[PDB]
Amino acid sequence: EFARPCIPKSFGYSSVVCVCNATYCDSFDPALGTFSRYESTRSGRRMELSMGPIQANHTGTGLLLTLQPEQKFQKVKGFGGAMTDAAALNILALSPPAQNLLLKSYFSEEGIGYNIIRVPMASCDFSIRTYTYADTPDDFQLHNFSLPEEDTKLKIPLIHRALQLAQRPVSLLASPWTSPTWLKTNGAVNGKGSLKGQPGDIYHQTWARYFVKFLDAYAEHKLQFWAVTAENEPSAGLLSGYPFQCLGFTPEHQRDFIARDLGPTLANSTHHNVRLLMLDDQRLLLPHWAKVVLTDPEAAKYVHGIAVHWYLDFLAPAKATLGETHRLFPNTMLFASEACVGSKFWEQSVRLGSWDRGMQYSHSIITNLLYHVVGWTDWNLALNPEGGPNWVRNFVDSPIIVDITKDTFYKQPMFYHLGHFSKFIPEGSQRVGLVASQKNDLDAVALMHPDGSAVVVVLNRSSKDVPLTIKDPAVGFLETISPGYSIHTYLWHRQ
């Protein structure tokens, strides 16, 4: 519609947030052989558009990044975030006009064109109430399964509004944290405990049927799922005292649950097209978890992909984990399903305007893309200034922070860093080769849109400006510069 600049505000951190309210939010409005550049900087530029010429020749010894359009890697599924109870409550705390600008920021082409929404199956830490959908004890046939108001009045109507705003088809992803407690060895939503008994038994068939019941219930409200994960962070339920909703699975337990219960139960339902993602956990668990599950032909036939979380990335070099998994199982897509900053005990939950947190998002996304990952999903879409609500006070940060007392929301550097990918990398884009002429400190990734046009994202996490050239053998050269602490997305038609 109308380009509207960022209203910047400092809270004493490395960069600014962009301030939006009931009546204002920043928003957005290429001939060959010109390119488009979108730039965001620590100094305060927010996805600003500029253009350049593509030259026929280049001479120099500076950094050159050469597109290898014939070297084809993964297709992109997409980008988005999570509609938790906390996110829904924060969004709905705004006046309806401000709610609409927040939703448009994320889901509109006038915003950043999210096409993924992760939906918890009942309560997680980012809930104010602890509940499942089948809390009546020993209800093995699930006669009393139902969605409560957290879904029917809060999450579902918000998801519908997001879908209405989006011009791209939106894919929903569901993940459970805990089963009903009466299905669990420890009889509690949290702590160390798994499903009682063994895969193939009444407890496991009931838990498998719960997934179908969830999907049935959402489909009654006219929402269809792209995928479900087999459990959020199954490793969590293996840990003594784990503080909030979880459900423990070893990789063998998960393998046999998928083979015997979950896979066949979904396959025999009207939801047989919904994809099943395994793991949904820290990538250090790869490739071991992939080997355990995927080398059993009975489990493998049901698994579409492997979902990863980013929290222990420091213990898990991408080559040894993502790269090795891809090498062994290249037909089982890798998908980043949850990330947030501010979650470590020593970290401040919310740092309004943190450029570092921004760069953390984009560095992870680029690294993921360079190691075959097909999409990347943020955690809570919005939180309050404390990084909540959260029933166990496990507060964290969010690209959007809602200030209820001011009917205001703040878009953080994380929002724009994610936007440098989500806005410009449609579903069906394919990552292609990009080689550097010399060692450098930049993170860079090249992809091709479904129509054959090019997209390159370049992140400079250093304080030093790096002039550089991008070579496309089809079109020519783009002479540019990557300022210290910047992120650029470059777009051009190749035909």
Ligand X SMILES: CCCCN1C[C@H](O)[C@@H](O)[C@H](O)[C@H]1CO
Ligand Y SMILES: *[C@@H]1O[C@H](CO)[C@@H](O[C@@H]2O[C@H](CO)[C@@H](O[C@@H]3O[C@H](CO)[C@@H](O)[C@H](O)[C@@H]3O)[C@H](O)[C@H]2NC(C)=O)[C@H](O[C@@H]2O[C@@H](C)[C@@H](O)[C@@H](O)[C@@H]2O)[C@H]1NC(C)=O
| Residues with active-site annotation | 233, 338
Q: Is residue 7 within the footprint of ligand Y (CB under 6 A)?
A: yes
Q: Is residue 21 within the footprint of ligand Y (CB under 6 A)?
A: yes
Least distance between ligand Y and beta carbon 7 (Å): 4
Q: Is residue 396 within the footprint of ligand X (CB under 6 A)?
A: yes
Least distance between ligand X and beta carbon 128 (Å): 14
Q: How many residues bind ligand X (CB under 6 A)?
A: 11
Rounded CA gap, 22 and 342, in Å?
Answer: 28
Q: Which is nearer to ligand Y, 23 or 198 (CB)?
A: 23
Judged by beta carbon distances under 5 to 8 A according to partner kind, the member of ligand Y, ligand X, none in contact with residue 32 is none
Least distance between ligand X and beta carbon 126 (Å): 6
End-to-end CA distance of the chain: give it in Å, rounded: 28
Q: Which is nearer to ligand Y, 24 or 140 (CB)?
A: 24
Q: Is residue 338 within the footprint of ligand X (CB under 6 A)?
A: yes
Rounded CA gap, 219 and 92, in Å?
Answer: 23
All residues at 6 or more sequence positions from 184 whose CB lies less than 8 Å from its CB, including other chains: 178, 193, 194, 195, 196, 247
Residue of 311, 335, 415, 477 interacting with ligand X (CB under 6 A): 311
All residues at 6 or more sequence positions from 12 whose CB lies less than 8 Å from its CB, including other chains: none
Q: Is residue 295 within the footprint of ligand Y (CB under 6 A)?
A: no
Least distance between ligand X and beta carbon 343 (Å): 4
Q: Which is nearer to ligand Y, 27 or 127 (CB)?
A: 27
Q: Is residue 92 within the footprint of ligand Y (CB under 6 A)?
A: no
Q: Is residue 24 within the footprint of ligand Y (CB under 6 A)?
A: yes
H/E element, 146: none
DSSP helix/strand/coil, 4: strand
**What DSSP state is assigned to residue 199?**
T
- The answer to whether 59 and 368 have CB atoms below 8 angstroms apart is no
* Listed ranges 18-26, 38-46, 297-305, 433-441: which one lies at the site for ligand Y (CB under 6 A): 18-26
449-460 as b/e: b if 16+ CB within 10 A: beeebbbbbbbb
Q: Is residue 23 within the footprint of ligand Y (CB under 6 A)?
A: yes
Q: Is residue 82 within the footprint of ligand X (CB under 6 A)?
A: no
Q: Which is nearer to ligand Y, 410 or 421 (CB)?
A: 410
Q: Is residue 140 within the footprint of ligand Y (CB under 6 A)?
A: no
Least distance between ligand Y and beta carbon 92 (Å): 19
Judged by beta carbon distances under 5 to 8 A according to partner kind, the member of ligand X, ligand Y, none in contact with residue 233 is ligand X
Residue 476 buriedness (CB in 10 A; 0-12 / 13-18 / 19+): middle
β partners of residue 54: 478
Residue of 233, 313, 378, 427 interacting with ligand X (CB under 6 A): 233
Rounded CA gap, 111 and 101, in Å?
Answer: 9
Q: Is residue 100 within the footprint of ligand Y (CB under 6 A)?
A: no
CA nearest neighbour of 15 among 283, 369, 413: 413
Q: Is the dihedral of CA 41, 43, 46, 47 positive or negative?
A: negative
* Listed ranges 19-27, 186-194, 260-268, 367-375: which one lies at the site for ligand Y (CB under 6 A): 19-27
Least distance between ligand Y and beta carbon 30 (Å): 28
DSSP helix/strand/coil, 383: strand
Least distance between ligand X and beta carbon 349 (Å): 10
* Listed ranges 17-25, 151-159, 352-360, 487-495: which one lies at the site for ligand Y (CB under 6 A): 17-25
- The answer to whether 245 and 178 have CB atoms below 8 angstroms apart is yes
